[PDB]
């Protein structure tokens, strides 16, 4: 949970949202059924021209409070051992201990 880790994940999220659409039509051109080979090649080279650290696959979502890479839950935004703290105090609406 170094501050550098959080800073650079924020940078990654900003830069992936920066383009966020050129990638879309470039993928559409590459995967198009009938698009000719030359368009395929131009799309490939254009998409590879983009910065490497600009794809959604490099985003590793962390705890928005501590930046813990592991034990993340997407229903909340919290990690494993901040969710329990929030839920015990009754902050989280709807969350209760259950047995069934």
């Amino acid at each position: 949970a170094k501050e550098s880790m959080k800073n650079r994940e924020l940078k990654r999220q900003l830069t992936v949202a920066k383009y966020a659409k050129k990638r879309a039509e470039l993928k559409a051109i590459i995967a198009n059924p009938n698009s000719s080979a030359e368009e395929r090649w131009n799309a490939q080279v254009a998409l590879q021209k983009q910065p490497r650290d600009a794809s959604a696959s490099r985003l590793r979502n962390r705890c928005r409070l501590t930046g813990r890479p592991h034990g993340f839950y997407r229903k909340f935004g919290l990690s494993r051992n901040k969710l329990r703290e929030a839920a015990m105090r009754g902050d989280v609406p709807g969350l209760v201990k259950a047995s069934w």
């Binding site: 590459i30 995967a31 395929r40 490939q44 080279v45 590879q48």
Partner: protein
């Protein structure tokens, strides 16, 4: 293996260097880090020094090693043997 939708995968800078190296024939190795790049059929007969993790190993390319990747000719672990 990569799908057949896009035949090869080659890096732009490595491809540019390879295509430059044909105006004057094979004389010097091309220094690179791109182990992910597949060898093309038209760069045969030229020597490429690929990164290893500590240095660059020189590989002389012949016709039989076309469909492979550069990183396949640079072992990243030593293991001289337990005994």
């Amino acid at each position: 293996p990569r799908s057949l939708k896009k035949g090869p995968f080659i890096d732009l800078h490595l491809l540019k260097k390879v295509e430059v190296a044909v105006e004057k024939n094979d004389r010097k190795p091309i220094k690179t880090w791109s182990r992910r790049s597949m060898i093309l059929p038209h760069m045969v007969g030229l020597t490429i020094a690929v990164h290893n993790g500590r240095q660059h190993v020189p590989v002389l390319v012949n016709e039989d090693m076309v469909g492979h990747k550069l990183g396949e000719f640079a072992a990243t672990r030593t293991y001289r043997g337990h005994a």
